[model samples]
Target: FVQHRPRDCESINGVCRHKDTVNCREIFLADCYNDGQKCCRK
Candidate 1:
């Protein structure tokens, strides 16, 4: 198993809403490679 860190982005009011989206995309990419499945949509 591999672990990836979330992308760093500037936040407004000290909050990171886009962090979740970046994490999700990273996971989807990892799953696609590990499982040989194309489960991500652009």
Candidate 2:
């Protein structure tokens, strides 16, 4: 079977940080679950 893509933030060790969140960094994931919500890492 093929490896599944990241369905959610936490699925790839990321956090759902909303757009405009200060001091947040985006992760290099496939995508996020919602608009304006990016998969971010601490």
Candidate 3:
């Protein structure tokens, strides 16, 4: 599962890049469903 791999609920402030998780899909998950992480936006 994607749980094993750690990630930020939001685009890490301005970092936007997880050099280590190069294979990770942070941007792809931008508008995708969250795994119950972070809060809602207005």
Candidate 4:
């Protein structure tokens, strides 16, 4: 439930990718990271 940027995302084993590219089970809050990037984890 936490919104994480690229570096922080990777620290937790999460990925910073576009919404369409994320097939993970959980997605964090959006529009805060890079353009079209979302923090997600499986």
User: Clashes in each model (backbone N, CA, C under 3 Å)?
Assistant: 0, 0, 0, 0
lDDT of 1 by residue, 1-42 (tens): 857744222211122233234432332322233233323223
TM-score of each: 0.13, 0.55, 0.17, 0.38
Off by over 4 Å in 2: 1-7
Best-performing candidate as measured by lDDT: 2
Q: What are the Cα lDDT values of the candidates?
A: 0.31, 0.71, 0.37, 0.56
Ranking by TM-score: 2, 4, 3, 1
Candidate 4 lDDT: 0.56
State the lDDT at 30 in candidate 1: 24
What is candidate 3's lDDT per residue for 9-31, written digit by digit as tens? 35433224433344444443333
The RMSD of every model to the true structure, in order and in angstroms, is: 11.4, 4.0, 11.1, 6.8
Q: Which regions of candidate 3 fall more than 4 Å away from where they truly are?
A: 1-19, 28-42
The whole-model C-alpha lDDT of candidate 3 against the native structure comes to 0.37
Worst 10-residue lDDT window, candidate 1: 7-16
Choose 2 or 4, whichever is better by TM-score: 2
Question: Per-residue error at 4 for model 1, in Å?
Answer: 9.1
- Report the lDDT of model 3 for residue 34: 45
Using TM-score as the measure, name the better of candidate 1 and candidate 2. 2
Q: Between the candidate structures 1 and 4, which one is better when assessed by lDDT?
A: 4
Top TM-score hit: 2
> In model 1, where do residues sit more than 4 Å from their true spots?
1-30
